[PDB]
Amino acid sequence: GPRVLVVGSGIAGLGAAQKLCSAAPHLRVLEATASAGGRIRSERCFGGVVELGAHWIHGPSQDNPVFQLAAEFGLLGEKIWSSSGTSVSLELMTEMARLFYGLIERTREFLNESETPMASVGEFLKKEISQQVASWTDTRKRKLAILNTFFNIECCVSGTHSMDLVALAPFGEYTVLDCILAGGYQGLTDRILASLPKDTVAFDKPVKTIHWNGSFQEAAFPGETFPVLVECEDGARLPAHHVIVTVPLGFLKEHQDTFFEPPLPAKKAEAIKKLGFGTNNKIFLEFEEPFWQFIQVVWEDTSPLQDTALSLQDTWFKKLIGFLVQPHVLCGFIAGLESEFMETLSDEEVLLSLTQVLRRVTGNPQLPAAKSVRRSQWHSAPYTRGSYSYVAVGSTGDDLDLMAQPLPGLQVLFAGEATHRTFYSTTHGALLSGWREADRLVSLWDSQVEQSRPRL
Numbered sequence: 001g002p003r004v005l006v007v008g009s010g011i012a013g014l015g016a017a018q019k020l021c022s023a024a025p026h027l028r029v030l031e032a033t034a035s036a037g038g039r040i041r042s043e044r045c046f047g048g049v050v051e052l053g054a055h056w057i058h059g060p061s062q063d064n065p066v067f068q069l070a071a072e073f074g075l076l077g078e079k080i081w082s083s084s085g086t087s088v089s090l091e092l093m094t095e096m097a098r099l100f101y102g103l104i105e106r107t108r109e110f111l112n113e114s115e116t117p118m119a120s121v122g123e124f125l126k127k128e129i130s131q132q133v134a135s136w137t138d139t140r141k142r143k144l145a146i147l148n149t150f151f152n153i154e155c156c157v158s159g160t161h162s163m164d165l166v167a168l169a170p171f172g173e174y175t176v177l178d179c180i181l182a183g184g185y186q187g188l189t190d191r192i193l194a195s196l197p198k199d200t201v202a203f204d205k206p207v208k209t210i211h212w213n214g215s216f217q218e219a220a221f222p223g224e225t226f227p228v229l230v231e232c233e234d235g236a237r238l239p240a241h242h243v244i245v246t247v248p249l250g251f252l253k254e255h256q257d258t259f260f261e262p263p264l265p266a267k268k269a270e271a272i273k274k275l276g277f278g279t280n281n282k283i284f285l286e287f288e289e290p291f292w293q294f295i296q297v298v299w300e301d302t303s304p305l306q307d308t309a310l311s312l313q314d315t316w317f318k319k320l321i322g323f324l325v326q327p328h329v330l331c332g333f334i335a336g337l338e339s340e341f342m343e344t345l346s347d348e349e350v351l352l353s354l355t356q357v358l359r360r361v362t363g364n365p366q367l368p369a370a371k372s373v374r375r376s377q378w379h380s381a382p383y384t385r386g387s388y389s390y391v392a393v394g395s396t397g398d399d400l401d402l403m404a405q406p407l408p409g410l411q412v413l414f415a416g417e418a419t420h421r422t423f424y425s426t427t428h429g430a431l432l433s434g435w436r437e438a439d440r441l442v443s444l445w446d447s448q449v450e451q452s453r454p455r456l
């Protein structure tokens with residue numbers, strides 16, 4: 001059948017290949033790195049497995065295709081410290097969570113608005129919190145410090161440096177549908193890859209440029225013509241009828257000018273520029289003995305009312321939201337520019353800084369140092385350049401639709417988490433986007449007979 005090349009071997013590209021390979025096209029998946037999975041990345045560490053990318057199945061239910069596949073594949077199981085060194089009360093934490101998450105729910109008021117009074121989620125949250133503080137008759141400092149951690153948690157969830165960068169009106173479009181895969185989330189992508197024909201995926205084969213809108217001859221005689229040519233970094237010249245591009249939005253942001261020849265249509269090129277693509281990283285620390293599920297950290301004397309969209313915390317580690325005890329391993333989460341700064345530090349500097357933080361935060365100066373560290377470095381990953389998309393101030397959910405828009409004749413199709421308007425930044429949005437592109441091609445192929453059908 002037709003020649004199809006899929007660029008990228010994350011869940012979107014594998015999902016597209018799986019549907020297409022199930023009048024079979026001549027299909028190849030070109031992966032830049034040495035293994036598949038992309039932002040699903042599981043590593044054997046500390047005598048177990050650590051998730052460097054995606055960790056949870058969001059909304060583990062019947063409608064979630066990722067949950068459905070994990071069940072079919074047998075991958076599922078049956079199922080607060082202050083920087084002062086003292087405990088924070090659960091009641092006060094609850095009261096501040098009610099206030100904060102109540103305001104997050106109110107962002108729905110801005111849905112479908114062309115001209116919102118404030119451009120961002122962070123500005124709306126700051127204004128409402130400032131009005132609330134004016135109602136409060138040292139307790140005020142503790143309240144603002146706890147609210148600061150909730151802003152930082154919300155940054156991690158959005159994968160943004162600051163909630164002031166997240167567009168307000170589009171925020172409510174995202175659909176909220178949480179569990180892990182004990183043996184590794186990468187087990188899911190490995191199983192989809194295994195279902196494909198032998199040698200469908202080529203590893204260490206990064207694509208340099210996609211040439212489209214042409215009539216390209218194949219090397220063999222007589223020289224059959226194709227609309228697209230994929231140029232690999234290694235010099236391979238691969239003709240195709242269709243190319244499904246699943247590369248991350250961070251890669252497109254850096255390379256869209258050279259990756260397509262001719263350049264992309266203006267509206268799509270602008271969608272790539274306007275959308276957000278932030279960094280979220282994990283830091284795993286291994287201890288010989290546990291000193292301790294989730295330890296939330298509150299940084300004394302901090303407040304979300306001081307910060308602007310691009311302000312940094314006093315130190316990089318003050319952006320850390322807390323630690324998840326791994327089911328002796330702790331996993332810290334950090335997002336934004338402080339997380340990008342973290343990636344530039346040596347493994348030793350991260351291990352030693354966090355040991356000092358943990359000794360201060362638990363109020364135990366004799367706490368033994370972490371034995372080892374493993375951290376992700378998503379912003380530094382040349383083929384990703386960050387963690388996941390968000391609808392940034394200046395962009396809308398319409399920009400996600402523009403990311404999905406195919407090029408003429410379906411010569412070039414786009415899939416990936418940043419092409420799904422309601423499930424962007426998830427594994428299920430990426431998988432569904434791959435199935436969407438496969439369905440679009442199958443309909444084109446099934447329509448080709450109709451071109452030869454006379455009316456009379």
Ligand SMILES: C=C=CCNCCCC/N=C/C=C(\C)N1c2cc(C)c(C)cc2N(C[C@H](O)[C@H](O)[C@H](O)COP(=O)(O)OP(=O)(O)OC[C@H]2O[C@@H](n3cnc4c(N)ncnc43)[C@H](O)[C@@H]2O)c2[nH]c(=O)[nH]c(=O)c21
Pocket residue numbers: 007008009010011012013030031032033036037038039040052053054055056057058156157178205206207208246247248251280281282376378383384386387388415416417418424425426427428430
């Ligand atoms: C309880 C309760 C209530 C809830 N509140 C609690 C808070 C929990 C919030 N959850 C947070 C979840 C996070 C952080 N999770 C999280 C954490 C972190 C640190 C990250 C990094 C992500 C995530 N996500 C996002 C997904 O990982 C991501 O969207 C998809 O994997 C992308 O797939 P893809 O589009 O195919 O791209 P890919 O990048 O996978 O594939 C593209 C491929 O293209 C390749 N490529 C690039 N350029 C190329 C070239 N030139 N030539 C060839 N190949 C090229 C490249 O090498 C890749 O292999 C999560 N998603 C999810 O569902 N659960 C989660 O837990 C998280």
Ligand SMILES: C=C=CCNCCCCNCC=C=C
Pocket residue numbers: 104105157158159171172174388424425426
């Ligand atoms: C209502 C409400 C809140 C909507 N919050 C949007 C979350 C952004 C999507 N990120 C998902 C996780 C990951 C990765």
